[PDB]
């Protein structure tokens, strides 16, 4: 079917049709252009017109221009032939390696797996990161989220995790770069090449890459998540595959949504956001999940605007994760890396019946002491430690060393820490933390604990200081 | 001796205490003023929002 461009504003193009009005979600192809310009139908304004969202810049379009109903929604190449390739929101390759030749094509809009399809197995996923493992452990086929204001560590953490987990993973992986830096995509691709996860020679790549960065018009950014998502869904269901899905940054999607929302003509909700915020997050977040058919462990980076966690975007996201790593500027500025907030990060697995009570008890042990420190903090602030009780000063000591032991060098951040990256095994973390708690190290200096792997290394660092 | 050392100690101590308090009065004002401003905007946006929906 052929409609005509009626109006154009940013990414919101209104197209009128005479004989066949395309259903909502259908992808239209604008005619008369050097490159593909897909329009996704958003609503029927009545009067035989449809209001759509462009998937690329709209410059050049002209009223009266011809548009064609694709007859379906954005459909993209799915299968193993996407492995090792970089693709667009609309599924075209952007790696200058030819067409992605697949048997099947999938549409980016699907419904979420049903209740009966859900899974409830809960297995811990050890990452080698002390704070995470101890206090807010991730879980196989689970939902993890890294909350972070600007330049706090979200991406570095994803990388480190990709390194520590993705690297030695059996199944496939899907990275989806949403609204982030182009150079990052580039940084990754080439790195992926090097360590061979991407092989440009054979069919041995384990990762499929989807990108719609900081340079795309809103509509694209608003859909790429869906795109990466789809690719992942394929491996899950069609091959009962155990997937890994990394997204940077899912905040961008919502942001993108707010960009076109006014254009769609909606009264804004709080903070200028689109009134459909939650539902949009919803029908999207709900497809990123493990099922009876397959497993999807997904790590998603969540940008926090102005550092405000009460912002509708992040706020609304907590409810979709199984484990959350809230990064803090305050901590990072203190020099603690990863800048994880220990009293603010949580995990549905932090249950004695799952991590064992030994784990459970150190975990809550640690938090309790930090909480305690916390109350003392008002006073230490005006009057310092002097006026403190002998007992109080002891929590403080311990807390300052527990606080220091929570930091750790990542390989990925070697260039900045000036130290060699470390991976600590769970039992090593459970342990090192007991001892600290248990006063086994009240003699060592704080500094000894800073920036180390296992406790054993902390003892040594103490000798070196002394 | 124990009085020179004491009156010495209190001195310095109270010296840093106000030094701490100051760093705080200066810090809190900023939070104040950021909130002050934000509150005003927040309201106006609400008004405008409702007016515009008529």
């Amino acid at each position: 079917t052929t409609g005509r461009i009626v109006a154009v504003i940013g990414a919101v193009v209104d197209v009128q049709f005479d004989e066949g009005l395309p259903p909502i979600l259908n992808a239209l192809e604008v005619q008369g252009r050097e490159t593909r310009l897909v329009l996704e139908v958003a609503q029927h304004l009545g009067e035989s017109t449809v209001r759509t969202i462009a998937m690329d810049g709209t410059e050049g379009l002209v009223r009266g221009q011809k548009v064609l109903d694709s007859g379906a929604p954005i459909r993209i190449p799915v299968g193993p032939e996407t492995l090792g390739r970089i693709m667009n929101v609309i599924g075209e390759p952007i790696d200058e390696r030819g067409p992605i030749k697949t048997k099947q094509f999938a549409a980016i809009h699907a419904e979420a797996p049903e209740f009966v399809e859900m899974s409830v197995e809960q297995e811990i996923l050890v990452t080698g990161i002390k704070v995470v493992d101890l206090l807010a452990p991730y879980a196989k086929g689970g939902k993890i989220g890294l909350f972070g204001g600007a330049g706090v560590g979200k991406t570095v953490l994803i990388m480190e995790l990709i390194n520590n987990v993705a690297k030695a993973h059996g199944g496939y992986s899907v990275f989806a770069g949403v609204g982030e830096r182009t150079r990052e995509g580039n940084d990754l691709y080439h790195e992926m090449i090097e360590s061979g996860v991407i092989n440009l020679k054979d069919a041995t790549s384990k990762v499929a890459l989807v990108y719609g960065q900081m340079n795309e018009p809103p509509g694209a950014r608003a859909r790429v998540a869906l795109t990466g998502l789809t690719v992942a869904e394929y491996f899950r269901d069609q091959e009962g595959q155990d997937v890994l899905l990394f997204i940077d940054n899912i905040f961008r999607f919502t942001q993108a949504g707010s960009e076109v929302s006014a254009l769609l003509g909606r009264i804004p909700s709080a903070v200028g956001y689109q009134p459909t915020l939650a539902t949009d997050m919803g029908t999207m977040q709900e497809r990123i999940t493990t099922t009876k058919k397959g497993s999807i462990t997904s790590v998603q980076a969540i940008y926090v605007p102005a550092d405000d966690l009460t912002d509708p975007a992040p706020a609304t996201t907590f409810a979709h994760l199984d484990a959350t790593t809230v990064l803090s500027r305050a901590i990072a500025e203190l020099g603690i890396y990863p800048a994880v907030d220990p009293l603010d990060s949580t995990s549905r697995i932090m249950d004695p019946n799952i991590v064992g009570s030994e784990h459970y008890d150190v975990a809550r042990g640690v938090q309790k002491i930090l909480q305690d420190y916390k109350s003392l903090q008002d006073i230490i602030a005006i009057l310092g430690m002097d006026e403190l009780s002998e007992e109080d000063k002891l929590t403080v000591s311990r807390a300052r060393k527990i606080q220091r032991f929570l930091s750790q060098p990542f390989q990925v951040a070697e260039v900045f820490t000036g130290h060699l990256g470390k991976l600590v095994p769970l039992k090593e973390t459970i342990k090192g933390f007991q001892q600290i708690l248990a006063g086994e190290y009240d003699h060592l200096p704080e500094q000894a604990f800073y920036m180390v792997g296992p406790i054993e290394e902390a003892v040594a660092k103490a000798d070196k200081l002394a | 001796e124990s009085t020179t050392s004491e009156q010495s100690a209190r001195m310095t101590a109270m010296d840093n205490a106000s030094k701490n308090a100051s760093e705080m009065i200066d810090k809190l004002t900023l939070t104040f003023n950021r909130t002050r401003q934000a509150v005003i905007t927040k309201e106006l946006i609400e008004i405008i929002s409702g007016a515009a929906a008529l």
């Binding site: 009057l383 002097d386 002998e390 | 050392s5 004491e6 010495s8 100690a9 209190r10 101590a13 109270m14």
Partner: peptide, 14 residues
Amino acid sequence: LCGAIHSSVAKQMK
């Protein structure tokens, strides 16, 4: 609030 007075003696008193 006298600095580390009362404590300094206190500790070394035991």
